[PDB]
């Protein structure tokens, strides 16, 4: 098998191809293992599941397919895009045997030993893609990556299982046994999905009217009027124009919301206390609380409030080399969803206000903030943006009902997503006893596998057709001089992605 | 071009044709102008946009097409209707030059000078139809009307623009140049849309059951029972019949709600204070509050509460000659959406009640009102009625998502609505200098244009098929004598619409 | 004639269309005039030439054709571009007569009176396009512009002419006489020229 | 806002005739398009005069002009990995939008815009 990475832009399609080198260890020393949360974990953190000897291939991030330059080409020139089909290949398989004896490691090729590969194309296994896990094909084509281990969760009561808990043995599926010189290929067609909106609106939902012309409709503009030395209740009505534009009758409503706490990138603005959980937005499922992250698509901040972001309401990526645990804000890249504030409520403020009572002579009108607003007829909204380093698709859970199944971390909801591609080194027993033993074999030859993997995805484009007169916004590299070029290697060969790149640069009217 | 107004009723279709005479001044003295809110405006009222020299034709009100008698014919005989296609014409164009000299105005026809016309049929301009603006074809065919000026809004930060703000020059579109003796025509096909519900339900969602037959299901009918000289907790259950009808198990839920303050048409019932804004129902978008008007479809009042209406929850039309600002209630016509109270919550009361706690021996059950209820599975609702003097369609905003896009002021949500029809007088420079000057011309011949416009719309009807035995409600003129006939001219030639007329007279079961 | 401004991007071509309104005075009160530098001008500034009653159309600036947004589209996405062909039109001609009498100006349309138009397609006149003069179609389509006056220079010795100096009378060319309701059109094909380099080198 | 073409002077020799103000050197450029109002004499004397007429009706002309140009493009095919430079409008708020009209209707071009944003190797 040959090496193919490039992008092919033709008409309204762009074909991306990526090739990487991978290495697959033996996981679990070939065993399936029951796993669960520690005895001391909080109820919110309990789980029960299985670890398996299998690995899996994950290309569920945009930078597995688009170079930074390709991404720029995409986002500056198109109002929409969406996956069409893909071709996946494993080739140049090599199985290597390791011998550690007497202090010295000696790796030797074993042309005969196999790896096993199958796609779960009937979606019979727990689908763990679409959880934003590490282990995807790396963004830089020269980086070699380890194939991540497949494990899954089932129902739990505390750290224990329940009757409904399921156990899957992956060897109960047919799989291809691949030797050196064997290749694995399959093709996949995406179901029809809406184009992702790679634009920002240039109008706000509350300013769709002609500012020059009054409405023929009236609104209640005054509830009382001067009487002698005092007021008297009098209802009075006006036709809204430009000057009272907030009062105009309108056809639509902003998108739903589920309110997030606001935190500041300026450390001093924040309360000195531990609220990351107690202040967090959450959902409550079967007695357990889970963080709602990133949650419903809501604008990250209002005008001129760049420093603020919702506590759990934005994707946050690590800078190159950032550690796992409690890194400072300078170690992460916080995405900003401000482009959708034309339609979607700001994540950190109320949806609006509703009346709570019935006013009368002795009772004044009362209102209350609305901090969670489910969908209402007439609402419109934008989904969360996608990012070069962000996820692509998610499997829509198989359920009686769902609403607007755009996966909340962003990307394309798929009923039949790209199937899980499972792989494992076939165990090779070491020297057996010459007396029969019924015990299952526990001594195996140490080995691992390596090879190349390629994934080709055809994307459909919706070309920008802007009729605006003035230039628009475009993603651009900096002109100024610098020690390192953005999206390159440094002097040590480390590739890095210095910033998140969304898709929403071009604009469109509502 | 000839004059065509009439209505043609054939089978399940009614074709409406309207012809009017229009006059188009020169707007902005041919200039595009940046416009914005005043420096002193509240944040809620800020805007940024452009005024253009162009005018536009707007027939987006039912009375542009239906005579009062036609409307009666429609609403008394049909359970539903919806637009199918339309034909639009401009003809008998006349361009007139005005000369004001020496005190005396002299208007002269200029057969050569042109008007420019284009439809935005690709929807590349900000769409300002569907904001309930004035300037539509007038209801009475003998009234001559001024073509309104086209302007639009884009993003703003206070009174300033932002990078994403867009500027549209309409001359960057192809347009037909029309002279005297030229006509402009185009045809348009409505996309499939649901029939408007021109009926009222004769059943309420909470009374769908057979009153004669008990349910086989049980509900919790008592939580405690007499014990010796005192009570003891005991759960007890009953099958609901007619006598406990409120308790029956049911399959459906009333429509969503977003609660409105209640105001009375009787002045004395109202609080003496200014609550028209502070008490108002609103949404909150990018740091700005906007009145929610008319908002989600909700019944205006409950049984026998005719005098009450939601503060911003009903369309309100002016009586003939009513002024723009702070008119008394006697100057306006307040619509009433009581017909939908069979399914949709009353706009001024709570959706219902939910439990807020977990009762036990030492803790009593607690409930709270629900003043905003987003959509739930099993909900059903009616959309707001349409009115003879009300809007017809609105453009569904171009967004990732929307829910039930029936425009909240009423009418038909269209992805591809009737296109904006833009027109302007071609500037004709006045006498130029005989020495070359690079400056753009600022001296033009004064002129205006006039002509006729006709719009033909074919409507599809869903004929009433009532199997009820007793007569039903029908819209009827008064029998009694009066000084003026409703929906006529007075002695001064002024046409007036004395009342709003909805569509919901006939009834149907749920 | 109808109004056409838009840009059409297809494959490896972009078609730009611009329409403007223009006004043409009477230049030189219909006369040809000899012109020259002032007597006091420096030798470096001397010239000799002719002013003519004719005007001319000049679209020799990019913003006559590309909107700013179009230009952005061009320069962000292409390594090169070059003109291929063009179509030019004059239409909706109106000839207006002005009467200034007794203090009052009255402008009246004259449907019969003509304008004369010709293209110098054999390049027999002094070619004054390409000198970066003002008077081109303005960048913003709603601006109305004055047609600039045609004049040219020939050889001079100081402010005087020489034997080799040439004089061109433009009425010695055939020209179309255009009335109200007449249109003028012609098409033109650019010769092959190198693509303009719409890139910067990333190497020195 | 700059020039497009220039006529290459008709000469025995020239070298690299790219016009120095920029744009395309053309041997046969777009032709000059000349226009003038036909003179209309005012009321003549009723006695014959050989003198050329010097009294004319004041007049001017107006109309529309359209120009359509087809341009050929050489599409960017950059194989560089990192993003490149692109012409972009400013994001920040401002009183006027660049390349628009102001409150008085005056259009303005706030900056020159060249063509050289994308890059290529030598």
Residue numbers in the entry:
A (entry chain B), B (entry chain J): 226 to 735
C (entry chain I): 226 to 429
D (entry chain I): 614 to 735
Q: What did the paper state?
A:
The AAV viral capsid is formed by an icosahedral (T = 1)6 arrangement of 60 viral protein (VP) monomers, and has a molecular weight of ~3.9 MDa and an outer shell diameter of ~250 Å.
Using this map, an atomic model was derived for the common region of the VP monomer, residues 226 to 735 (VP1 numbering), which was symmetry expanded by icosahedral matrix multiplication to produce the full 60-mer viral capsid. As in previously reported AAV structures, the VP1u, VP1/2 common sequence, and the N terminus of common VP3 are disordered. In addition, the AAV2WT structure is ordered from residue 217 to 735, with the additional N-terminal residues compared to AAV2L336C (residues 226 to 735) occupying the base of the interior opening of the fivefold channel. The AAV2L336C variant displays a 2–3-fold defect in genome packaging compared to AAV2WT and lacks PLA2 activity resulting in a defect in infectivity. The annotated differences in AAV2L336C support these possibilities.
